[PDB]
Design a protein around this ligand. Structure first.
Ligand SMILES: [Cl-]
Ligand SMILES: [Cl-]
Length: 162
């Protein structure tokens, strides 16, 4: 297992524009297009993202290309962020993937807001971080996904994904 296989399980793959769990237009492997209620705005962000006139449908290669870029961007956002970088640097390789998964889902700013959890993660107080991570809108809106990510932080293994 690695970050790619993990996020592919968590996000799925859809080749036509769809609404994510928050109701936002999305494509591919959780690639958010726009928070705007307009499908036309979404189609326009999609064409711009892909570089061709898509009419709301992309190929598998194209979905995986956006996915590669988004994973890359999630990593870059962690390393650029003063609150996220030291936590990531402190973590082993499996728990690093859990942090990338959170940033991919909710963005660098959203994750940087988990001040107390991040501190516990840095201190390697795994059971405590896991309890604090769960007291969140994130956990109450997407409990199954959040539980898998939290379990990864708690155990440092891929057991929730196997
Ligand atoms: Cl893009
Ligand atoms: Cl979920």
């Amino acid at each position: 297992m690695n970050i790619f296989e993990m996020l592919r399980i968590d996000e799925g793959l859809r080749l036509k524009i769809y609404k994510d769990t928050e109701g936002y237009y999305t494509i591919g492997i959780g690639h958010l297009l726009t928070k705007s209620p307009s499908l036309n705005a979404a189609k326009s962000e999609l064409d711009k993202a892909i570089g061709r006139n898509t009419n709301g449908v992309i190929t598998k290669d194209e979905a995986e290309k956006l996915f590669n870029q988004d994973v890359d961007a999630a990593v870059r956002g962690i390393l650029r962020n003063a609150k996220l970088k030291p936590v990531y640097d402190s973590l082993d390789a499996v728990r690093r993937a859990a942090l990338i998964n959170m940033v991919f889902q909710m963005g660098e700013t959203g994750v940087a807001g988990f001040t107390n959890s991040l501190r516990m993660l840095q201190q390697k107080r795994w059971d405590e971080a896991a309890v604090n991570l769960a007291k969140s809108r994130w956990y109450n809106q997407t409990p199954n996904r959040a539980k898998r990510v939290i379990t990864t932080f708690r155990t440092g293994t891929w057991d929730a994904y196997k």
